[PDB]
């Protein structure tokens, strides 16, 4: 029964989050014995991290991240209210990244 309750928590998230996790699923939620590099998502194959810029191989030009720095904060602020901030990929807007960088280096 606990499994049916968990599936209800994942389907209760906003559609904006469910959509993002569907095309950018982290290795944590993937199957146990599955590998990260294999069975990649068509969105992940284009860019592993949608928040970081990617340099196109054929043309030496950097493509902007699929989600701007403003949109990166809306997902973090939306993922933190539902306790799903651990699934979002690395981002300079993460609450733990903003704090670690301050404590490590400081002003």
């Amino acid at each position: 029964a606990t499994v049916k309750q968990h599936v209800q928590l994942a389907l209760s998230l906003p559609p904006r989050l469910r959509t993002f996790l569907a095309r950018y699923p982290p290795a944590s939620i993937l199957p146990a014995g599955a590998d990260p590099e294999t069975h990649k998502t068509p969105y992940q194959e284009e860019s592993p991290n949608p928040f970081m810029p990617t340099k196109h191989p054929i043309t030496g030009k950097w493509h902007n991240p699929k989600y701007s720095l403003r949109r990166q904060a809306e997902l973090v602020k939306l993922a933190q209210e539902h306790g799903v901030e651990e699934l979002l990929p690395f981002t300079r807007k993460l609450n733990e990244e903003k704090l670690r960088k301050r404590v490590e280096l400081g002003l």
Partner: protein, 56 residues
């Protein structure tokens, strides 16, 4: 009257560069891929993180 109008508005498709024709072609294929779906297994694992970060 409208058939000869859309054929006039879309008459510039013959002046497309090989690169422009390539981007539009890839987009036609991308739209056919659809949106990935979340399996019940993946949904169950997402619920654990929500419950753990809310109740414990």
């Amino acid at each position: 009257e409208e058939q000869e109008k859309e054929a006039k508005k879309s008459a510039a498709k013959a002046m497309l560069t090989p690169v422009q024709e390539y981007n539009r072609k890839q987009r036609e294929l991308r739209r056919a891929r659809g949106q990935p779906a979340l399996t019940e297994e993946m949904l169950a694992k997402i619920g654990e993180v929500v419950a753990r970060n809310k109740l414990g």
